[PDB]
Amino acid sequence: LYASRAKHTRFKSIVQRTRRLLCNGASGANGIRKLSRGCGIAVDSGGQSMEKAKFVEALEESGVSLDSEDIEAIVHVLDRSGDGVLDPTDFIAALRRNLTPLKLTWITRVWYTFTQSKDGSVYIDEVLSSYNAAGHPDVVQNIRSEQGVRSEFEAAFSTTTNPDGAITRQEFEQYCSGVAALCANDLEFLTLMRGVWPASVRTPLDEETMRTHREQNPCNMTFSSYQTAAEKGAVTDVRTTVAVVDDIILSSHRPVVIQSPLAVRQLSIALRRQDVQRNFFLSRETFLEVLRGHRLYLKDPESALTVLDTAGDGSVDYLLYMNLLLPPLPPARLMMLERLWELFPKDTCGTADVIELHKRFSAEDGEEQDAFLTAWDVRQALYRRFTFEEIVEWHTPLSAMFELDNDFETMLKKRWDFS
Amino acid sequence: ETGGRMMALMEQQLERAYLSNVRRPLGKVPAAMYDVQVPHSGFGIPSEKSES
Amino acid sequence: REIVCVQAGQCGNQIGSKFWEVISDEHGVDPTGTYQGDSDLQLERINVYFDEATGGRYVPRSVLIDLEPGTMDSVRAGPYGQIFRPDNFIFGQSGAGNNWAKGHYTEGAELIDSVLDVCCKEAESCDCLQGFQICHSLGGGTGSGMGTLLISKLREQYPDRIMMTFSIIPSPKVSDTVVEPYNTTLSVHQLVENSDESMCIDNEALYDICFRTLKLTTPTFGDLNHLVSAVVSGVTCCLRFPGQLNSDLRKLAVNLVPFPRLHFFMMGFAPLTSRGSQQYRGLSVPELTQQMFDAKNMMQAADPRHGRYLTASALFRGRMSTKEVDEQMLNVQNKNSSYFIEWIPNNIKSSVCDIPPKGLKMAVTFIGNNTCIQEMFRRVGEQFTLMFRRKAFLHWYTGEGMDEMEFTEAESNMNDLVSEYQQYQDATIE
Amino acid sequence: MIGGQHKKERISERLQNCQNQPKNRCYLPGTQLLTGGYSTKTLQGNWSEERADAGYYDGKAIVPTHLSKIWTTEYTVMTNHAMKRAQEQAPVFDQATLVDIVDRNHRAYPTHQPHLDPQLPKLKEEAFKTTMRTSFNHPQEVVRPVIGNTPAAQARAIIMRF
Amino acid sequence: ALERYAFKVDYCDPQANLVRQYLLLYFAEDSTIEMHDLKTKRVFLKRCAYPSLTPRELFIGATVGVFSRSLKLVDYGDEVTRRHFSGSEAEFVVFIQEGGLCHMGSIIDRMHTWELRITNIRLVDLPDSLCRDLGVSRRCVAILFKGSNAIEKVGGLSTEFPNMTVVVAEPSDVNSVRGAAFGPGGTTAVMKNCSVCVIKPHAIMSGYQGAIIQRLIDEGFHITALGMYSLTVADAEDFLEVYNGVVPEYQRLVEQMSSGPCWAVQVCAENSVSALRAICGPHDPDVCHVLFPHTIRSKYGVDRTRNGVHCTDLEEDAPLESEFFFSLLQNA
Amino acid sequence: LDLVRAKHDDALVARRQRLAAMLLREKEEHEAMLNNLTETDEQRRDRL
Numbered sequence A: 001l002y003a004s005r006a007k008h009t010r011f012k013s014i015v016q017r018t019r020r021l022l023c024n025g026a027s028g029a030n031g032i033r034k035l036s037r038g039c040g041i042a043v044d045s046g047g048q049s050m051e052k053a054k055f056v057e058a059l060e061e062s063g064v065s066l067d068s069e070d071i072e073a074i075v076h077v078l079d080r081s082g083d084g085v086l087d088p089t090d091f092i093a094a095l096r097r098n099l100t101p102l103k104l105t106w107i108t109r110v111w112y113t114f115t116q117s118k119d120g121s122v123y124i125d126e127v128l129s130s131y132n133a134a135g136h137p138d139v140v141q142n143i144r145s146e147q148g149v150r151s152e153f154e155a156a157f158s159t160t161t162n163p164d165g166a167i168t169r170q171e172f173e174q175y176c177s178g179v180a181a182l183c184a185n186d187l188e189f190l191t192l193m194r195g196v197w198p199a200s201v202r203t204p205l206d207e208e209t210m211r212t213h214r215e216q217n218p219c220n221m222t223f224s225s226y227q228t229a230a231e232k233g234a235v236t237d238v239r240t241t242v243a244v245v246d247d248i249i250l251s252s253h254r255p256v257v258i259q260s261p262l263a264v265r266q267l268s269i270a271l272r273r274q275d276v277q278r279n280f281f282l283s284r285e286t287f288l289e290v291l292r293g294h295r296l297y298l299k300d301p302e303s304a305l306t307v308l309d310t311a312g313d314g315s316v317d318y319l320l321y322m323n324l325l326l327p328p329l330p331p332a333r334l335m336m337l338e339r340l341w342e343l344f345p346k347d348t349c350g351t352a353d354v355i356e357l358h359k360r361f362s363a364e365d366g367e368e369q370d371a372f373l374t375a376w377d378v379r380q381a382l383y384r385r386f387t388f389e390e391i392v393e394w395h396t397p398l399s400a401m402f403e404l405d406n407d408f409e410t411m412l413k414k415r416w417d418f419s
Numbered sequence B: 001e002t003g004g005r006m007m008a009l010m011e012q013q014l015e016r017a018y019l020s021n022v023r024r025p026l027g028k029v030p031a032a033m034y035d036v037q038v039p040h041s042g043f044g045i046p047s048e049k050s051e052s
Numbered sequence C: 001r002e003i004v005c006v007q008a009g010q011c012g013n014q015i016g017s018k019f020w021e022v023i024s025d026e027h028g029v030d031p032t033g034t035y036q037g038d039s040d041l042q043l044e045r046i047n048v049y050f051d052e053a054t055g056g057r058y059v060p061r062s063v064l065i066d067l068e069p070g071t072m073d074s075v076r077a078g079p080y081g082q083i084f085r086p087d088n089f090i091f092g093q094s095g096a097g098n099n100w101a102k103g104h105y106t107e108g109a110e111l112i113d114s115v116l117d118v119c120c121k122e123a124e125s126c127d128c129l130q131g132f133q134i135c136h137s138l139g140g141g142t143g144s145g146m147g148t149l150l151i152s153k154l155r156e157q158y159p160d161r162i163m164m165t166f167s168i169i170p171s172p173k174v175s176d177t178v179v180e181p182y183n184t185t186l187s188v189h190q191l192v193e194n195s196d197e198s199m200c201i202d203n204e205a206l207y208d209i210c211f212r213t214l215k216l217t218t219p220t221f222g223d224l225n226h227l228v229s230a231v232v233s234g235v236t237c238c239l240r241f242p243g244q245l246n247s248d249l250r251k252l253a254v255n256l257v258p259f260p261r262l263h264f265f266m267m268g269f270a271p272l273t274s275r276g277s278q279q280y281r282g283l284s285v286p287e288l289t290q291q292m293f294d295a296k297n298m299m300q301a302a303d304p305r306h307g308r309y310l311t312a313s314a315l316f317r318g319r320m321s322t323k324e325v326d327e328q329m330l331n332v333q334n335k336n337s338s339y340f341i342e343w344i345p346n347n348i349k350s351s352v353c354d355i356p357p358k359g360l361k362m363a364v365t366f367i368g369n370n371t372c373i374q375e376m377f378r379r380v381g382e383q384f385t386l387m388f389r390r391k392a393f394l395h396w397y398t399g400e401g402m403d404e405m406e407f408t409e410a411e412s413n414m415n416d417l418v419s420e421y422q423q424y425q426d427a428t429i430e
Numbered sequence D: 001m002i003g004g005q006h007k008k009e010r011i012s013e014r015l016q017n018c019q020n021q022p023k024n025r026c027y028l029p030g031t032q033l034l035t036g037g038y039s040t041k042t043l044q045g046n047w048s049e050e051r052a053d054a055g056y057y058d059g060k061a062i063v064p065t066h067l068s069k070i071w072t073t074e075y076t077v078m079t080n081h082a083m084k085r086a087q088e089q090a091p092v093f094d095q096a097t098l099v100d101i102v103d104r105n106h107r108a109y110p111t112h113q114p115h116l117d118p119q120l121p122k123l124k125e126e127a128f129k130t131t132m133r134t135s136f137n138h139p140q141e142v143v144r145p146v147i148g149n150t151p152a153a154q155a156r157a158i159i160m161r162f
Numbered sequence E: 001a002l003e004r005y006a007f008k009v010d011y012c013d014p015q016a017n018l019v020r021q022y023l024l025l026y027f028a029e030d031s032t033i034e035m036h037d038l039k040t041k042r043v044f045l046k047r048c049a050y051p052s053l054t055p056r057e058l059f060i061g062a063t064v065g066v067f068s069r070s071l072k073l074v075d076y077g078d079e080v081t082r083r084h085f086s087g088s089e090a091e092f093v094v095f096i097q098e099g100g101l102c103h104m105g106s107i108i109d110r111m112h113t114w115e116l117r118i119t120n121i122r123l124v125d126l127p128d129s130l131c132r133d134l135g136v137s138r139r140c141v142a143i144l145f146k147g148s149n150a151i152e153k154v155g156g157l158s159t160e161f162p163n164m165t166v167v168v169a170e171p172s173d174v175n176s177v178r179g180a181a182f183g184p185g186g187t188t189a190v191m192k193n194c195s196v197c198v199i200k201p202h203a204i205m206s207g208y209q210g211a212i213i214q215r216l217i218d219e220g221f222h223i224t225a226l227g228m229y230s231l232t233v234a235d236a237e238d239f240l241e242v243y244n245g246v247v248p249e250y251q252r253l254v255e256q257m258s259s260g261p262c263w264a265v266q267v268c269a270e271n272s273v274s275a276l277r278a279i280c281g282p283h284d285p286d287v288c289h290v291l292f293p294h295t296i297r298s299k300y301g302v303d304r305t306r307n308g309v310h311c312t313d314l315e316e317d318a319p320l321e322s323e324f325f326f327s328l329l330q331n332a
Numbered sequence F: 001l002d003l004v005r006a007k008h009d010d011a012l013v014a015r016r017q018r019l020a021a022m023l024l025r026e027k028e029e030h031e032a033m034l035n036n037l038t039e040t041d042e043q044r045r046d047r048l
């Protein structure tokens, strides 16, 4: 019965290779969008059905060649009905979320800086005006010029590409996944995103603290043949701190929270309540006091919190902490949850009301109704509004109880309505 | 010839479904067919108390 | 607790080469002599058979003797041959001529002192010496004469140690040499006085094992010598690995021999089964016990069903329960009670060792002391009596110098051995 | 320590072309610490005392092999539960302290191992103390029994103290 | 063909630290071998069957393994073999221009199918004088090779791969490119955001090297450097310092890497070390054959010592290994 | 000189520790992937 797991590993390798090949071609950051346009996708999260031969010829014209065994693996993973038909949005989702947690954190952070419409879309005028090409690291080091990068970005988003004039979340994530595959590592992506999208960071800081934080990043600390003893020791200290924080989080904090949706939801509420700027940052003492109230502890707060500081000012990024704490979901289940999310009206900052959740739920036993009402209390919600990440975190522990995606389909249809 | 470790692990995985391996293991009590809970003080009735 | 091996003549040297292959494999010794094993359990008793030379290498505590160097040059030239110490190869310049008297009296006394010098050099270096182990054939020329000569010298020099022999003996069904009965009779006369324990194997039984049990299409002498090397390496297993019920060569001797002349044993090894069949039957202690007592699995032509067991021993290798072992040995003793000597209350000793041979989950070697061995010696004595009445080839032996009185003495001693075995088979408790 | 690295040749020894026996460190080819004619891996001679050394290292890879799993003794199966818990903690030294241990610098007698003594720091603080200085300090500056190992006894004693 | 080959080989003895010489004979009618000792005039091994040894692997400068001994073929021991190898000793150069870097793995595989032995390889950038004289591009791959009927065989690359190969046959141009392309000098390897993959000697003799390189190209990675180097025992030890005390096959890896020449490639991509580790697979081929059947080590590996390829594990050492391969070994 | 050598050997040992931890974690993770490679009767009944 190891053929299935061989197929799954092959699917992961296929996703890796497809992401590298598309972004290295003629259209670098626009490869995934071009693939989606070629496949014939017209709805962002629709359930349009597409037959296998058209999918393989679409990938062939995109620039990726697959023989029989990779086609079989893709069909096995994606076709959940056995009818010989599949939905390419699952493959595009698999290409979309293949990132390290820091990249996903900052990609999510940039998206909420915009002004969202009645139906979750964002206008093209705002995203065109909010781009700042002067801060591109390519321009600052003086390899290319501002006009060139401005022209290429304007060609990326134009009236012929999007006749309606509104960009969805999925399209922006596809573009950011494209532009992420060209950067070398996490630090390059952070520098590019900070320089290009300036509204992401709310307060500036001097170049001295920024350069000291940049020099101490794990990417720059790396061995060499002609090193001296002190700088070897510095590299050792940085690497040991990163390893200890990662393994203590994974070994200790995850088993406490992953056993029930109630714990995840309550921890998310506790973290989000203390945020006043709504930029996913907290002070150190506030973070330690929040974690103390939920039976999670650290052996050395000064060394442990130096890796959750992705802003360089001494704050704590709890979005990255929650991303590292919980495991990512498979793309099919994420598509299911986004199809559920489509049925909610949204305000200017991208939230929906909790009453909408309440009138769309249908439990079976008393215990699950009690847990749902306790977690999704109207009084405990921030401002009677909830976001999509809260839904993802609530559904993550339930998704770990099933191995096949058809079971998750059936449970979603039973619990929820329409989707 | 032995086909390494993965084949051996799967071979032992296919073995325990035998009834003999279930009801007759080596140096062990055969496993229970339902869950049991061991009380804090152990099994048996606690001794009844009386007034001083 | 270290053993010193001696290999004599063509048969002995050939079996020895396979034995040292099997032992080097079990302890993970490369044919260059470098340790390449994969568990500490291999290293921790390596001293038992190997001495350590400087660096990586280990050298095997063995003396190689032959009268013409052809075999010795073949063993030195073999794939594992390099491991052997060069100074340990002793050879002459002319053959035994298939003559016992030549091998014992003329060239034997010429070489024998250098062999004792090497054996003494090896023995006195040991911190505590266990018994000697010797492989030779009784039907040959150099095998019989120098093996029994050397056995006598080592028995003079180390009377408090153990004396163990493995010996191949002529069958009437497929003889390779005409004068086999004389050499066999004189050698059995020497062994019954000198030895502490002697193991006997028939080539006919190894052919029947190969053809019927293993269904080999074209077995070769390498296979027969591999089966023998398997049993030889199995008897010593408790010396060199941990276990739940340890055993020792001296403990085997004390439990098996009731009276000092009754020291001749049968051999078997149980998990023999063809590659096609292995998918159809799992190993277990009842299955091993059933093969273990099946005469199909015994390495002599005499069958247990015509005699009775005085004593037997079984050494088990592997992880198994002692209850199942004890009750299996009891059930076999109770169900077949007429084949067990009644004035001994329990005839079988068991022993259990944790570490099986590589690629087997479990294995057992069986040693049996049964009166049916008398038929084999009787057959050899018949052929001797047919040949001796007519002086058929005697002038060769007399020309070397033997008195005819030796032949009548050797016949009388072998006939007395047969009589001693036959009387205990046919007896009552009274 | 892991991988040895303190049994190997030092640069000073290589530059000075030092030989073996003046200091008797077995690193040069053809020389090895032979106990009873064999290495310390074999149970002959003085293996128990040589394994008790502060600088002893056994060549066991952290990543285990298959035959180690297959070949196990009954005693190991019996006592493996305690071994898993007992393998959690072990003392460790840095490289300078290992150099000091190998060079056996500060010892009262040749076999004195102070780095394996758990009471060494309190001995160091306790050193150089005189009877009068302890006994003649400044005069201005200077329970119901409970029996049993039962946790109830400990709880009662702690409650009384509080 | 032949009825009997004869070579003399040297065997590096680790216990003695001497170099011993033997005489190796191969009988092609029934595939048996036999070894003699030159210093003693005595037999080392009878005629014994050895099916893992094939006549195709017998050439000068090759390495073979006979009963856990690594033998290196040194010189012809007979005049029949000397006459049979009267050719196959001239060295020629084939270049791959810029348009052919995407097809270089197939080029190397095609050369291996043509019974051609590569004696050196490097990815270089030539001076302008040789660039104009020979007719090649600035950035090119230089392959040095020898074999039987070499010129007539390499003529097929003009029609299989149009306009991406240049063949050199004149000895003077070969000497000029040998002095210029190879030897001490600079390198094109980067010093950050890189990974190093090493092709083991056994895969070199078996010849899966072109398939490995072409798989790397197909997956999307970029090759920024490439060369072949021969490692001494001390160099092999210093290359595998971090694997001491961690894996059980340290000494076997040392002797395998010191057995013969090895190819070293450099890979640059996004998250290069993790991506290369994922594409190569786990350390043990047994796990690969069950759970990761598409990995490189599943196809080109038989055990832990001879898993085919070697890849960097810690992201702290990628510039260290790149430097050790492309500066310390190359320059001096 | 010997003291400086020890100062380098420290970092070497630290790298060895990190590698050993990673390899043990991966080896344990691989063996847990063979746990549930079994087929139950319920799925077979569902197919029928």
Ligand SMILES: Nc1nc2c(ncn2[C@@H]2O[C@H](COP(=O)(O)OP(=O)(O)O)[C@@H](O)[C@H]2O)c(=O)[nH]1
Pocket: C008, C009, C010, C011, C012, C014, C015, C096, C098, C137, C139, C140, C141, C142, C143, C144, C168, C170, C175, C176, C203, C221, C222, C224, C225
């Ligand atoms: N089992 C076995 N028997 C052998 C072997 N070589 C020879 N024999 C037998 O031993 C007898 C010949 O004895 P031999 O060893 O030549 O006596 P020697 O001349 O004194 O050494 C014949 O019965 C052969 O069949 C062998 O390798 N294995």
